[PDB]
Amino acid sequence: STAGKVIKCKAAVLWEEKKPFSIEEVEVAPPKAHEVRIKMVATGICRSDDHVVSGTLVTPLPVIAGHEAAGIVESIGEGVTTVRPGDKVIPLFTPQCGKCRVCKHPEGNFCLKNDLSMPRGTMQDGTSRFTCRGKPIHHFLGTSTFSQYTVVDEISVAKIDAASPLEKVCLIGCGFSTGYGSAVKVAKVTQGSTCAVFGLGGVGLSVIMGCKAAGAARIIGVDINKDKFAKAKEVGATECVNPQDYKKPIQEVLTEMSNGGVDFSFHVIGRLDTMVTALSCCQEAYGVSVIVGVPPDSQNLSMNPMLLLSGRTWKGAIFGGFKSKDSVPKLVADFMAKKFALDPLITHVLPFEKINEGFDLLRSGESIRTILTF
Amino acid sequence: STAGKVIKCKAAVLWEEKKPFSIEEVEVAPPKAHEVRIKMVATGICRSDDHVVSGTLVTPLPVIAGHEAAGIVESIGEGVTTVRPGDKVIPLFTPQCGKCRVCKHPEGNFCLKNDLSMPRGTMQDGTSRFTCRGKPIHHFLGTSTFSQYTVVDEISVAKIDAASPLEKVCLIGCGFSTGYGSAVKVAKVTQGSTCAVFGLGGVGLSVIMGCKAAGAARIIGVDINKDKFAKAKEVGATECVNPQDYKKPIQEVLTEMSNGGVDFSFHVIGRLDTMVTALSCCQEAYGVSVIVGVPPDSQNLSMNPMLLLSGRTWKGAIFGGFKSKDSVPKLVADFMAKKFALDPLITHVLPFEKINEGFDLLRSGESIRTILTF
Ligand SMILES: CC(C)(COP(=O)(O)OP(=O)(O)OC[C@H]1O[C@@H](n2cnc3c(N)ncnc32)[C@H](O)[C@@H]1O)[C@@H](O)C(=O)NCCC(=O)NCCS
Ligand SMILES: CC(C)(COP(=O)(O)OP(=O)(O)OC[C@H]1O[C@@H](n2cnc3c(N)ncnc32)[C@H](O)[C@@H]1O)[C@@H](O)C(=O)NCCC(=O)NCCS
Ligand SMILES: [Zn+2]
Ligand SMILES: [Zn+2]
Ligand SMILES: [Zn+2]
Ligand SMILES: [Zn+2]
């Protein structure tokens, strides 16, 4: 019915920074060559979406935000070969073009067609598929999932198992994969190792799941909020520490606990002043520290490079280091085989039209993840 | 034979900071259990030795410095099994005890018995083998090579090829191995890659040698002293750039030269304000930057963690990442098999008693390496 025609639907438009989302009637254009229009099924609310609201993730406004989601293909443009109408799909906020120097590299995943480094808020062709009362609305990270229908470039969508429960596997689009890959792909946590995870939100919980899957002997969760500890232990933490409970700095506490430093540390907080702590607690000769979270308006930190000169490695990644289009379908197949659970991450489910309530849950710290259902 | 008896010989004692070396008659005690007394044949003058003079590498004084050297075993203490009198040896400023968690780790080489982290200036047993008119003199890094005879712990000496030229292979004791391993061991430079080397002293030249050995397609030398360029190009640099020649910051120049960043970058200068440049010039998704050189009085550097979040790796090492006792003999065997050259690193040779003239050459920037011969 709808192929080749404009669809009128509802979307959450952000007209201006520091305002609530507005549920608007929007027009969604049909897909052009190598583009895919998706009926959204479920979308998560992630911190990066809230950073758009706060104006600390700078991207052009007005905008349809949302980047962690799952849906069903409504139609495909000319030349699309990797998905068909009816297929379940996850939009990829980190694309996989397959052609740039990063996509061709065995260890790179931050494809040069991404819209995260210098956001333009468009499709790959420099235009938008959304209007509201005639006014063009920007895309966000090539995804724009806070809409009943979106249009994405082929390089920014993966086909997934037809039997997938979309209201769970949407987390594979951002938070789960970010944390899980930080452990299994970026750090390559080893069997028998000791890990420290700084921050026990949904992404840090996913980091734990990854360390556990990799066979870590010890997984030390670190959070200032002791309410986060029970879920951390449920998904794999062997122990949890609150820096506020100790009369010395937590890097010293962790180095003592680990008999001279941990094998792997992960920084999973949108804060600067915890990053050098996380680096320093790994063993000085062979420890590895991974940066997963950063504040959005990120300033410089202060550190002593002798922390690296002894043999430490410090690295980060986007999207868990996973080549996105190769990996997302594989992560879904693993979920279907019960290799990991997503239910512990999902604290709240709301209809889409309650998007503002979902953000209020995020800002208050009450949610791990809220999933919006269309 | 001198075995089992005190040796009276000459050594260069540093009595106080910021003074010339004094050539003194010293008494060298015989080796105790698990110790080895070595007749020095040649010793290099390295920047770290001069930092001892400056008072910026803190180690107890008075001291016999010197850590890059080669000699012949004069005698062995009780229980020594890995060297015999008459053997050619290189003292190891980074020990290999073989027992600590680092020695046991596949990737670690900064053995916990080292005297670099918190120098005490003694033998492993907490005592000294040196006296100068009855006054005890400190050891340096468990080596003290600025003496006609020294005593070292067995975990700080390696047996090398009986046929090796000691006046060349002494470089394997610090400068050569540091730069070469930074490339082949720490960074693991790949065939066809683009490397950037910051600092074209002896260690930066050895980095270049390692990158060439690894099959790098482009090796960009960076130095503020253009007199260092010709030798850099002799040993493998494809081009050299002087930051003083450019209006833009050199990370921008190098990113443009390399069409979006280099594969590997190396920081080989005792200065802080070049380290973030070196990290930033590597490709943002898969670039690796290695810290080889640091200033001794090292303060905190300012950096933005967003440089790592895109996928860059930042790491450092001591002694090129080589497990020292395992690797030094193999490096000497490679040299004897003509797998690399050391002559390009040796710019000056002086008799030992002209040590202060050798430090003048280092301080002025005139030398790459001076070797002292006994
Ligand atoms: C932080 C990231 C990974 C989101 O993680 P997550 O959703 O788990 O964050 P969340 O705020 O819910 O959790 C953070 C946790 O840190 C804890 N925390 C806060 N301060 C501290 C502290 N001083 N010590 C320990 N824990 C702390 C909080 O109590 C909380 O439990 C994300 O926002 C981020 O920064 N990503 C960077 C990469 C990126 O921008 N990718 C683009 C797509 S999102
Ligand atoms: C710097 C190290 C590696 C010694 O290297 P090397 O002998 O090659 O040093 P050297 O001073 O000769 O050369 C440094 C070169 O940097 C160049 N340089 C100086 N400033 C700049 C600049 N702004 N940009 C580019 N090049 C510069 C100099 O002109 C010089 O050619 C060493 O001192 C060090 O810091 N090692 C750290 C590890 C350690 O302490 N190990 C213990 C045993 S040494
Ligand atoms: Zn790409
Ligand atoms: Zn996200
Ligand atoms: Zn050891
Ligand atoms: Zn040295």
JSON list of C-alpha atoms in Angstrom, two decimals, chain A residues 175-193 195-197 202-219 232 235-237 264 266 268 320 322 331 334 339-342 345:
[
{"chain": "A", "resi": 175, "resn": "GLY", "atom": "CA", "xyz": [23.80, 0.06, 25.00]},
{"chain": "A", "resi": 176, "resn": "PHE", "atom": "CA", "xyz": [24.21, -3.76, 25.11]},
{"chain": "A", "resi": 177, "resn": "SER", "atom": "CA", "xyz": [26.59, -4.00, 22.24]},
{"chain": "A", "resi": 178, "resn": "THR", "atom": "CA", "xyz": [28.66, -1.00, 23.45]},
{"chain": "A", "resi": 179, "resn": "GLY", "atom": "CA", "xyz": [29.33, -2.58, 26.81]},
{"chain": "A", "resi": 180, "resn": "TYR", "atom": "CA", "xyz": [29.55, -6.28, 25.67]},
{"chain": "A", "resi": 181, "resn": "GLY", "atom": "CA", "xyz": [31.94, -5.48, 22.86]},
{"chain": "A", "resi": 182, "resn": "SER", "atom": "CA", "xyz": [34.11, -3.29, 25.10]},
{"chain": "A", "resi": 183, "resn": "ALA", "atom": "CA", "xyz": [34.87, -6.48, 26.97]},
{"chain": "A", "resi": 184, "resn": "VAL", "atom": "CA", "xyz": [34.85, -9.24, 24.26]},
{"chain": "A", "resi": 185, "resn": "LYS", "atom": "CA", "xyz": [36.14, -7.22, 21.24]},
{"chain": "A", "resi": 186, "resn": "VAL", "atom": "CA", "xyz": [38.08, -4.13, 22.45]},
{"chain": "A", "resi": 187, "resn": "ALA", "atom": "CA", "xyz": [39.73, -5.43, 25.64]},
{"chain": "A", "resi": 188, "resn": "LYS", "atom": "CA", "xyz": [39.52, -9.16, 24.64]},
{"chain": "A", "resi": 189, "resn": "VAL", "atom": "CA", "xyz": [39.17, -10.06, 28.32]},
{"chain": "A", "resi": 190, "resn": "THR", "atom": "CA", "xyz": [40.91, -13.41, 29.05]},
{"chain": "A", "resi": 191, "resn": "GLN", "atom": "CA", "xyz": [39.88, -16.49, 31.04]},
{"chain": "A", "resi": 192, "resn": "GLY", "atom": "CA", "xyz": [40.91, -16.27, 34.69]},
{"chain": "A", "resi": 193, "resn": "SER", "atom": "CA", "xyz": [41.47, -12.51, 34.59]},
{"chain": "A", "resi": 195, "resn": "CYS", "atom": "CA", "xyz": [38.32, -6.93, 35.70]},
{"chain": "A", "resi": 196, "resn": "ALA", "atom": "CA", "xyz": [37.14, -3.63, 37.23]},
{"chain": "A", "resi": 197, "resn": "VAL", "atom": "CA", "xyz": [34.03, -1.97, 35.80]},
{"chain": "A", "resi": 202, "resn": "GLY", "atom": "CA", "xyz": [23.10, -0.51, 31.53]},
{"chain": "A", "resi": 203, "resn": "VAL", "atom": "CA", "xyz": [26.33, -0.24, 29.58]},
{"chain": "A", "resi": 204, "resn": "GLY", "atom": "CA", "xyz": [28.47, -1.23, 32.58]},
{"chain": "A", "resi": 205, "resn": "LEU", "atom": "CA", "xyz": [26.17, -4.13, 33.24]},
{"chain": "A", "resi": 206, "resn": "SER", "atom": "CA", "xyz": [26.74, -5.16, 29.61]},
{"chain": "A", "resi": 207, "resn": "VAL", "atom": "CA", "xyz": [30.49, -4.86, 30.20]},
{"chain": "A", "resi": 208, "resn": "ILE", "atom": "CA", "xyz": [30.05, -7.29, 33.11]},
{"chain": "A", "resi": 209, "resn": "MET", "atom": "CA", "xyz": [28.13, -9.71, 30.96]},
{"chain": "A", "resi": 210, "resn": "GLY", "atom": "CA", "xyz": [30.99, -9.63, 28.47]},
{"chain": "A", "resi": 211, "resn": "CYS", "atom": "CA", "xyz": [33.66, -10.20, 31.10]},
{"chain": "A", "resi": 212, "resn": "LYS", "atom": "CA", "xyz": [31.65, -13.10, 32.43]},
{"chain": "A", "resi": 213, "resn": "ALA", "atom": "CA", "xyz": [31.26, -14.57, 28.92]},
{"chain": "A", "resi": 214, "resn": "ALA", "atom": "CA", "xyz": [35.03, -14.31, 28.49]},
{"chain": "A", "resi": 215, "resn": "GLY", "atom": "CA", "xyz": [35.66, -16.30, 31.65]},
{"chain": "A", "resi": 216, "resn": "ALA", "atom": "CA", "xyz": [36.98, -13.63, 33.98]},
{"chain": "A", "resi": 217, "resn": "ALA", "atom": "CA", "xyz": [37.66, -15.03, 37.46]},
{"chain": "A", "resi": 218, "resn": "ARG", "atom": "CA", "xyz": [36.86, -11.68, 39.20]},
{"chain": "A", "resi": 219, "resn": "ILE", "atom": "CA", "xyz": [34.62, -8.83, 38.06]},
{"chain": "A", "resi": 232, "resn": "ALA", "atom": "CA", "xyz": [25.58, -6.01, 38.93]},
{"chain": "A", "resi": 235, "resn": "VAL", "atom": "CA", "xyz": [24.63, -10.41, 35.78]},
{"chain": "A", "resi": 236, "resn": "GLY", "atom": "CA", "xyz": [28.10, -11.45, 36.91]},
{"chain": "A", "resi": 237, "resn": "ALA", "atom": "CA", "xyz": [29.94, -9.14, 39.26]},
{"chain": "A", "resi": 264, "resn": "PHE", "atom": "CA", "xyz": [41.32, -5.03, 32.55]},
{"chain": "A", "resi": 266, "resn": "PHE", "atom": "CA", "xyz": [36.55, -0.19, 31.98]},
{"chain": "A", "resi": 268, "resn": "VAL", "atom": "CA", "xyz": [31.66, 3.46, 31.83]},
{"chain": "A", "resi": 320, "resn": "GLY", "atom": "CA", "xyz": [31.94, -1.91, 21.43]},
{"chain": "A", "resi": 322, "resn": "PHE", "atom": "CA", "xyz": [32.06, -4.11, 16.52]},
{"chain": "A", "resi": 331, "resn": "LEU", "atom": "CA", "xyz": [24.59, -10.69, 18.47]},
{"chain": "A", "resi": 334, "resn": "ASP", "atom": "CA", "xyz": [23.44, -15.23, 20.29]},
{"chain": "A", "resi": 339, "resn": "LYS", "atom": "CA", "xyz": [23.99, -16.83, 25.35]},
{"chain": "A", "resi": 340, "resn": "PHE", "atom": "CA", "xyz": [23.16, -13.59, 27.26]},
{"chain": "A", "resi": 341, "resn": "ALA", "atom": "CA", "xyz": [19.98, -12.04, 28.76]},
{"chain": "A", "resi": 342, "resn": "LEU", "atom": "CA", "xyz": [18.68, -8.48, 28.07]},
{"chain": "A", "resi": 345, "resn": "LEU", "atom": "CA", "xyz": [18.73, -4.08, 31.55]}
]
